[PDB]
Structure formats: structure tokens, C-alpha cells
Nucleic acid binder design. Structure first.
Length: 366
RNA sequence: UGUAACUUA
């Protein structure tokens, strides 16, 4: 427009950056190789004291993002030096979060990375603010970006926030928080996973039937480098309430996941002889529990799924040393008992499926 | 017969 007639050194780069027309003008000027280095250097010096302002700006953030693909190391470094103590405010912000992710995505070196982490430390960001960011609509996308871009050696402030008091509940039982927590465990180190796994088990009753928390428990059941400890821990914490948990909407999926995990281990043998022997002892104990409460499980709206999972011969066909003996005496007993209970559930819409699972047991037995 | 969660002209 009338702007594109003035020399670049006479542009008020602040007023343009906060203006839609002006911001688009500067971006497409950075994309002009003749002007690129010059506008950048002319832009950088004038907007330098307004970095935080531009970052949180509806139009300014678009310039900052674009500017990240052109800055030098020293330039981007000095940018981060100016704004690192304000990362919480930035991450919370609708526009700031888009800027910080792009900054994190275009880091040049550890000096820049450590400055960002330094801002997330307790010196500038309290634990309750980190917890906030994890559960925040916008901030959680910054925590994720850290989780995917930076190395786990930098995850300190995140780990510290989760293991603090009962924050594991606040996070796991939250829509945004449960996601980030699963994103973390996917790249975390084993010792960091343990540190979190302790807090989860400690607050297990508050997570296992939670609408989101149950997904955290199930995610832990996929981490193979946990079976040596997690199988005994859970079952010892849930055995007495195993029937109750099987009849709940959310925790029943965990039970099914648990049972399936027990099968895939003992079937793989035919992990570790400590894990396996424990898996066998739990499974046998589980079948004992399901026989005692068979009357209730077969009729419950959620219990029946766990019962079917346990009765599905598709999961334990190779089980047909001495363990396999008293297994069949228990799982076989449970089959013939379920067979007697069939006409007492004819009013239910799932009697057909259960009757078929005792039919599949005969096809494999005889 | 039964659950997800993961964002600006």
C-alpha cells in the first residue's frame, strides 16, 4: 500500500506488527530474499523491548512465528533471554502458546533450551502453575512440545510437579492432563516412570474408576519394563475389591486389560520366571474370585465383559508345568458353572455370547 | 450389553 513506498529503515515496525495488514506485510518482506536479512535486522532491534508484547498479540504472534525461521542464533538467544521468566503467562495465553511452541520448535542449541527450562523451574514458575499448564487448554500444547522436542534430562519441572502431594490425581483425572501424562510416559526414562508409578499406585483408588484415570492405569499395563513390580502391586491393592471394580463402568476395562496381560505372558512362556510365576498365581487367584462372584458378574452390565474376557478360550488355548493342571481344574469348573447359569440370564441381550464361549471351550477340550 | 483425551488471520 502506501507503506510499500517508504525505505525499510523508516518503518515503525511495532505499529505494523500489531496490525493485520502490517503484520502480513512484514512476513512477506521476510520472504523477500533482497529484503530478508535487512528487514529482520531492522525489525529485531526496534521490537526487541516489545518481545513479550508481540508474543501475546493476535497479530504479533504471527510475525514472531515467521521470524523464528530467519533469526540467527544470537538473535534467537537474546529473544529467549528476554522472555524466559514469562513462560507461564505465555503458555497460558491463546496467542502466546502458538509463539512459544514455534520458538521451542526452532531452537538452535542447549543454551537456548536451558534458558527455556530455567523459566519453567520453581524460580519463575511454581509447581501449582506447572500443574495448571498441564491441565490448561493452551498450556498443555507447550508441555507436549517440550516433551517431544527436548530430552528427558530436562523433564525435571514436569516430573517434580506430578509427584508432588496428590497432583497425580489432579492431572490424571483431567481431560488435558491425562493426555500429557500419556505423552510423557511414551518418551520418559525408566526411573522417571517409576517415580510417577509410585504416586499412581499410592492414589490408585482415585484413578482406577475415573473416566480418564483408568486410561493411565491401562497405559502402565503396556510398559513391559514394569511387569516385575506392577502386577503384584496392583493386584494386592485391588484383589478384595476386584468384583466391585469389574462391575464399574470405567474400572472394568482395566480389569479386562489386566486379565489379558496375564494371559499374554503365560502364553508367551509356552518375560521372567519371577514375573511368570507371579502371573500364574494371580491368574489362578483371579479365577477363584470370578467363580465365587460368578452369580453377580454374569448379570452385571459391566461385569459380564470381564467374565467373557476370562472365559474366552481364544486367550488361553495353549494352556490346555504343574500350573496347567490346576488351571484347567479351575477354568473348567468355571465353564461348567457358567453353563448352569445360562437359563438364569436369558432375559439379557448377551446370553448368546456367553453360551458360545462355553461352546468354544468344548471345541478345544475334547 | 460398556469409556476416552490431545488448541489463533
Amino acid at each position: 500500500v502506501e507503506i510499500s513506498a517508504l525505505p525499510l529503515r523508516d518503518l515503525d515496525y511495532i505499529k505494523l506488527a500489531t496490525d493485520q495488514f502490517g503484520c502480513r506485510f512484514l512476513q512477506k518482506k521476510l520472504e523477500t530474499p533482497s529484503e530478508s536479512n535487512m528487514v529482520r535486522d531492522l525489525m529485531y532491534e526496534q521490537i526487541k523491548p516489545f518481545f513479550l508484547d508481540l508474543i501475546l498479540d493476535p497479530f504479533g504472534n504471527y510475525l514472531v512465528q515467521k521470524l523464528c525461521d530467519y533469526l540467527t542464533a544470537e538473535q534467537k538467544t537474546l529473544l529467549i533471554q528476554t522472555i524466559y521468566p514469562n513462560v507461564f503467562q505465555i503458555s497460558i495465553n491463546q496467542y502466546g502458546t502458538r509463539s512459544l511452541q514455534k520458538i521451542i520448535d526452532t531452537v538452535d542449541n542447549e543454551v537456548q533450551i536451558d534458558l527455556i527450562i530455567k523459566g519453567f523451574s520453581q524460580e519463575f514458575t511454581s509447581i501449582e502453575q506447572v500443574v495448571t499448564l498441564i491441565n490448561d487448554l493452551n498450556g498443555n500444547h507447550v508441555i507436549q512440545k517440550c516433551i517431544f522436542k527436548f530430552s528427558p534430562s530436562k523433564f525435571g519441572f514436569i516430573i517434580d510437579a506430578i509427584v508432588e502431594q496428590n497432583n497425580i490425581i489432579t492431572i490424571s483425572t483431567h481431560k488435558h492432563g491425562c493426555c500429557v501424562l500419556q505423552k510423557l510416559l511414551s518418551v520418559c526414562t525408566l526411573q522417571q516412570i517409576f517415580k510417577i508409578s509410585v504416586k499412581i499406585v499410592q492414589f490408585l483408588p482415585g484413578l482406577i474408576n475415573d473416566q480418564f484415570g483408568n486410561y493411565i492405569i491401562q497405559f502402565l499395563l503396556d510398559i513391559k519394563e514394569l511387569d516385575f513390580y506392577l502386577l503384584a502391586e496392583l493386584f494386592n491393592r485391588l484383589s478384595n475389591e476386584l468384583c466391585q471394580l469389574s462391575c464399574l463402568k470405567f474400572s472394568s476395562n482395566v480389569v479386562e486389560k489386566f486379565i489379558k496381560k496375564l494371559f499374554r505372558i503365560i502364553t508367551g512362556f509356552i518375560a521372567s520366571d519371577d514375573v511368570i510365576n507371579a502371573s500364574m498365581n494371580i491368574l489362578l487367584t483371579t479365577i477363584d474370585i470370578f467363580t465365587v462372584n460368578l452369580n453377580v458378574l454374569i448379570r452385571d452390565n459391566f461385569g459380564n465383559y470381564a467374565l467373557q474376557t476370562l472365559l474366552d478360550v481364544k486367550n488361553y488355548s495353549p494352556l490346555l508345568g504343574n500350573f496347567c493342571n490346576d488351571f484347567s481344574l479351575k477354568i473348567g469348573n468355571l465353564i461348567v458353572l457358567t453353563k448352569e447359569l445360562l437359563p438364569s440370564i436369558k432375559t439379557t441381550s448377551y446370553a448368546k455370547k456367553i453360551k458360545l464361549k462355553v461352546k468354544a471351550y468344548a471345541e478345544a477340550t475334547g
